[PDB]
Amino acid sequence: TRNGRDSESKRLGVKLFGGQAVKAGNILVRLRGTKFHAGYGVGLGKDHTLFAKVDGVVKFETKGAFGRKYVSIVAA
Amino acid sequence: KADIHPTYEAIEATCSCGNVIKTRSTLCKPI
Amino acid sequence: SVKKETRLRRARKARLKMRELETVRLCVYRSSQHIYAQVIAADGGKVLASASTLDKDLREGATGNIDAAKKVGQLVAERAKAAGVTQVAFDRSGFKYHGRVKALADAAREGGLEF
Amino acid sequence: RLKELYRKEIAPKLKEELQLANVMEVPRVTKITLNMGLGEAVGDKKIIENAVADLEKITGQKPVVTYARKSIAGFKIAAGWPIGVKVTLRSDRMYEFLDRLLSISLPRVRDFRGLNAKSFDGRGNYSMGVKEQIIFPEIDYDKIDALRGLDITLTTTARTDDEGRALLRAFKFP
Amino acid sequence: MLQPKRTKFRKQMTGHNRGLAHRGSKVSFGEYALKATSRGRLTARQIESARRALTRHVKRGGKIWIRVFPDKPVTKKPLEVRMGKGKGGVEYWVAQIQPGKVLYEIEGVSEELAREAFALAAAKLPLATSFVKRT
Amino acid sequence: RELIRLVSSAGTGHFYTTDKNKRTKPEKIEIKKYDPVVRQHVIYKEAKIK
Amino acid sequence: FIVNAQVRSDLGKGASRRLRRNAGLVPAVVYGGDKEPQSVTLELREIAKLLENEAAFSHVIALNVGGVKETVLIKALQRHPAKGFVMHADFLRVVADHKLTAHVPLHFINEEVAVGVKQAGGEISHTISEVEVSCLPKDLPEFIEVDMAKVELGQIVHLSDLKAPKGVELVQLAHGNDLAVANIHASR
RNA sequence: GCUUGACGAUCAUAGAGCGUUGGAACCACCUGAUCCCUUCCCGAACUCAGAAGUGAAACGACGCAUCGCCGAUGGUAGUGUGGGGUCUCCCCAUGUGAGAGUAGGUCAUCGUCAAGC
RNA sequence: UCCUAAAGAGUAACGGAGGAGUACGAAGGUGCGCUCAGACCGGUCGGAAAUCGGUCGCAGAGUAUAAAGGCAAAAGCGCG
Numbered sequence: 001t002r003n004g005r006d007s008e009s010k011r012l013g014v015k016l017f018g019g020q021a022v023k024a025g026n027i028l029v030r031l032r033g034t035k036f037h038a039g040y041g042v043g044l045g046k047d048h049t050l051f052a053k054v055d056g057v058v059k060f061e062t063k064g065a066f067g068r069k070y071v072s073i074v075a076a
Numbered sequence: 077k078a079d080i081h082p083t084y085e086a087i088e089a090t091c092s093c094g095n096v097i098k099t100r101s102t103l104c105k106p107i
Numbered sequence: 108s109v110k111k112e113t114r115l116r117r118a119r120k121a122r123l124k125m126r127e128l129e130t131v132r133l134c135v136y137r138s139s140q141h142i143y144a145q146v147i148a149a150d151g152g153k154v155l156a157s158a159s160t161l162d163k164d165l166r167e168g169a170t171g172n173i174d175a176a177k178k179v180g181q182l183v184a185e186r187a188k189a190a191g192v193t194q195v196a197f198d199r200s201g202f203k204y205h206g207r208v209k210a211l212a213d214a215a216r217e218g219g220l221e222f
Numbered sequence: 223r224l225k226e227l228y229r230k231e232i233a234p235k236l237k238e239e240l241q242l243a244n245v246m247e248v249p250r251v252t253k254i255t256l257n258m259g260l261g262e263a264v265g266d267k268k269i270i271e272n273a274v275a276d277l278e279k280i281t282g283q284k285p286v287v288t289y290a291r292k293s294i295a296g297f298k299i300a301a302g303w304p305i306g307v308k309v310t311l312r313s314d315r316m317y318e319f320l321d322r323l324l325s326i327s328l329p330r331v332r333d334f335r336g337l338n339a340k341s342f343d344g345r346g347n348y349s350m351g352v353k354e355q356i357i358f359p360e361i362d363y364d365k366i367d368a369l370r371g372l373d374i375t376l377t378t379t380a381r382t383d384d385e386g387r388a389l390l391r392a393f394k395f396p
Numbered sequence: 397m398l399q400p401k402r403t404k405f406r407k408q409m410t411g412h413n414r415g416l417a418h419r420g421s422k423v424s425f426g427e428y429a430l431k432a433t434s435r436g437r438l439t440a441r442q443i444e445s446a447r448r449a450l451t452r453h454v455k456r457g458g459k460i461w462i463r464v465f466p467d468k469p470v471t472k473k474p475l476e477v478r479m480g481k482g483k484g485g486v487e488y489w490v491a492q493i494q495p496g497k498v499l500y501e502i503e504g505v506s507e508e509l510a511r512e513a514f515a516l517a518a519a520k521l522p523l524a525t526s527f528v529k530r531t
Numbered sequence: 532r533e534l535i536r537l538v539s540s541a542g543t544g545h546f547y548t549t550d551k552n553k554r555t556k557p558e559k560i561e562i563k564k565y566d567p568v569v570r571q572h573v574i575y576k577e578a579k580i581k
Numbered sequence: 582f583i584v585n586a587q588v589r590s591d592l593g594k595g596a597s598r599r600l601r602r603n604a605g606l607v608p609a610v611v612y613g614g615d616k617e618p619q620s621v622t623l624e625l626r627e628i629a630k631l632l633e634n635e636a637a638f639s640h641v642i643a644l645n646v647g648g649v650k651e652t653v654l655i656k657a658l659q660r661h662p663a664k665g666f667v668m669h670a671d672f673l674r675v676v677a678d679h680k681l682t683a684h685v686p687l688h689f690i691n692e693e694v695a696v697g698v699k700q701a702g703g704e705i706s707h708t709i710s711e712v713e714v715s716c717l718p719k720d721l722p723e724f725i726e727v728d729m730a731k732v733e734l735g736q737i738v739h740l741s742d743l744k745a746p747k748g749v750e751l752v753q754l755a756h757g758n759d760l761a762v763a764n765i766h767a768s769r
Numbered sequence: 770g771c772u773u774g775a776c777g778a779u780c781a782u783a784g785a786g787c788g789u790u791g792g793a794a795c796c797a798c799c800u801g802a803u804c805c806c807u808u809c810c811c812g813a814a815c816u817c818a819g820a821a822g823u824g825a826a827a828c829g830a831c832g833c834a835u836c837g838c839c840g841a842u843g844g845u846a847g848u849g850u851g852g853g854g855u856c857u858c859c860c861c862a863u864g865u866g867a868g869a870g871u872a873g874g875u876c877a878u879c880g881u882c883a884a885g886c
Numbered sequence: 887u888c889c890u891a892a893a894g895a896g897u898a899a900c901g902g903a904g905g906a907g908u909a910c911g912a913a914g915g916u917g918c919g920c921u922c923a924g925a926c927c928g929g930u931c932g933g934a935a936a937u938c939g940g941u942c943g944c945a946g947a948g949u950a951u952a953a954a955g956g957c958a959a960a961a962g963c964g965c966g
Contacts, residue, residue, distance in 0.1 A: 033956035081931040092376035094345020096928035101377040105310035107811035152777035154882035257938035421662040496662030
């Protein structure tokens with residue numbers, strides 16, 4: 001019945017938007033279960049964190065079947 | 077006596093009516 | 108059919124893994140008549156070399172055994188040496204790695220075409 | 223047996239009995255399940271093996287046991303997980319199975335009317351009955367208390383009603 | 397009164413009542429109707445009171461459609477109550493009304509009897525209403 | 532889940548530490564693990580942290 | 582049926598609101614599958630007199646923009662939801678070889694002589710007028726007759742139960758949607 | 770220059786449905802399971818040896834817009850900024866501008882390799 | 887964990903809703919394989935219902951656990 005109780009608001013979402021230069025370890029998307037999928041040179045960590053495996057710029061392409069949003073890094 | 081009772085119901089369309097509604101034919105394994 | 112759409116679903120994991128790693132691929136396509144072998148570059152959409160059973164020097168009438176796959180083994184290995192490729196990955200294409208798929212893989216591997 | 227009658231009469235009877243254009247849509251003969259419902263006394267783990275032993279030698283072939291799917295706790299309990307049994311005799315095994323069902327072993331127990339009369343569902347009816355778990359070779363007066371049942375229907379491996387009543391008969395067999 | 401049979405939650409926010417009624421503005425079932433021309437709030441005993449005015453002034457037949465439906469619950473703090481001790485409990489129900497919302501519809505009567513029946517209906521409602529026919 | 536200790540079958544005194552449900556899996560654990568003090572994989576077989 | 586029209590070289594929100602409140606006008610468009618769309622101003626007083634007609638929407642309307650005259654079927658209408666008057670009119674080109682769906686009213690002819698009314702006590706419940714059709718412009722039903730004379734108490738007339746006059750395709754019958762047109766039922 | 774395979778690009782304007790049509794090459798179904806291999810029980814899947822037959826099933830190509838899916842123009846709603854009003858809401862200037870629906874589309878378009886014509 | 891929260895983060899209330907103080911040696915790893923659930927219609931103990939044969943099917947199933955978000959390379963399911 002009685003009612004308080006929130007939690008500490010985990011700061012999720014898109015870091016490193018769609019034209020930005022990335023280094024080879026940077027967190028792309030903090031994610032709660034794959035909104036965005038792992039593209040060309042990006043990694044998919046344990047808690048579905050997208051991180052960069054190479055350098056370049058972020059792409060954010062909507063590719064393929066299943067309508068999936070991909071974060072990929074184009075070496076440019 | 078009138079106490080014994082068989083219990084067979086998916087045999088029971090008229091013997092080989094095709095399906096009952098579940099559609100395939102002859103013998104019993106998915107082998 | 109329900110056989111073929113099942114085996115493409117079986118294959119799809121390794122197909123989709125070899126385009127992540129950027130690996131040149133050695134695909135097979137067994138049929139009930141005979142088997143095909145094909146070398147595909149590291150994007151999926153371009154062919155480096157290709158060697159079938161219906162190359163016109165080994166169409167025989169006994170085509171489609173575990174022997175014809177072993178012939179296609181060196182027949183694709185010596186065509187891939189011309190194309191300049193090692194460190195290829197073997198794609199069994201949802202076929203079980205046991206018979207003429209295994210024989211084609213071993214006979215291509217014997218011709219220095221390194222998996 | 224599915225033989226001299228089949229490979230020289232039945233497969234050329236049905237091309238001009240159903241007026242089929244080419245051959246192969248003449249019906250083949252494939253697959254069902256018994257689904258012999260051993261879920262009576264569901265919390266057992268002791269009579270399933272007797273049921274498998276019952277169904278083993280009357281079919282000459284090993285079954286598996288078929289497990290429960292849901293926890294439908296109104297009819298019975300949900301912990302009684304092994305509740306089934308199952309054996310196909312193949313087309314290769316149908317030969318000695320066809321001349322053992324309704325060849326000399328048609329009187330299972332009794333009927334007053336085994337009519338081919340009262341089912342118009344558009345899929346190819348027949349008439350025969352199986353309620354006894356004893357009417358088969360290699361069964362005793364008493365060696366184990368035999369409580370079972372065996373369930374066979376047949377379906378078209380083919381299109382429709384009248385295209386599937388005709389292949390299912392083989393002899394003067396109502 | 398009209399209440400939902402059960403709702404997913406018990407308390408809503410207060411919210412706002414903006415816009416015009418683009419959906420709900422056509423006489424879709426009847427021939428004549430009581431359309432609102434001002435925005436407001438109908439409290440499910442206003443709705444039933446105007447309903448009874450209509451169904452009692454017809455006396456002969458017809459078919460009356462009640463188009464609005466109170467699905468918004470409204471709370472209340474009781475008296476001698478300090479503010480802010482949790483949100484108060486539900487008392488009644490409310491349909492949010494926009495200008496253009498058709499409230500009631502009738503067929504099977506004459507236009508004169510319909511007009512002087514929706515006059516009785518509009519007498520019991522805190523809105524500014526009007527009379528419309530089927531287009 | 533009371534915690535246990537998995538000591539190395541090799542001659543060292545290296546131990547990995549974990550839990551176990553005692554009232555369901557009471558037999559001891561013989562999992563092959565990596566010992567750093569000898570730098571090979573060996574079996575670990577222990578309980579009784581005290 | 583004739584309306585006068587203009588050219589409308591200025592499009593947008595505040596433009597349209599100025600047409601409605603200053604000039605007294607009403608925006609519109611004319612379009613068909615064969616020509617470019619054309620935006621048009623009309624007069625509210627001059628289109629509101631067409632909308633008074635019962636056969637307004639199921640009829641050829643000649644429409645004169647300049648000296649150019651077009652044949653026009655009104656296939657859309659927007660309307661102020663509270664006050665109730667026409668904002669932009671949104672009508673369609675008419676060609677002699679075209680499928681040309683429009684809405685046509687139902688007209689419910691002889692309801693006093695109804696055997697579910699005179700002998701049996703019951704009332705007629707029109708659930709539907711304004712049936713949508715599919716017809717060449719040569720046959721434009723200004724009305725569609727619905728005979729409710731030989732219909733008993735409790736009985737329902739559907740879309741199959743009435744007439745399609747000389748090559749008129751009722752749209753919902755071309756699907757599996759046989760809608761209920763009218764109704765005779767017991768009173769309250 | 771087209772047909773059949775395999776692999777991709779793209780993910781419904783590419784789908785589903787209905788109809789016609791394909792066998793010689795190809796593929797599918799097919800024959801048999803000694804032998805590899807397999808069946809919570811299989812040669813009906815997986816596998817091997819095939820070459821008697823069939824294109825019925827499946828798959829492919831061509832048709833059709835009834836279904837699905839795309840989808841204008843115009844208007845409407847919203848809204849940044851600035852100002853008003855009768856200020857729980859709207860209006861004006863200015864910039865922007867949908868969702869829905871309407872007209873109308875769509876029975877895909879590409880590339881690499883291999884056999885055939 | 888969701889809302890409030892104003893389409894990046896963050897954001898208060900004795901504001902609105904629910905949960906946790908753990909489980910697991912496989913419920914982890916890997917290789918290989920496989921889809922769930924639902925109506926249907928089937929009466930000689932169950933009769934809407936168990937066991938299956940799936941025609942239509944068209945993710946609505948499942949996920950150790952609350953909610954949200956995710957799942958065909960299934961992250962679901964079975965075996966070595």
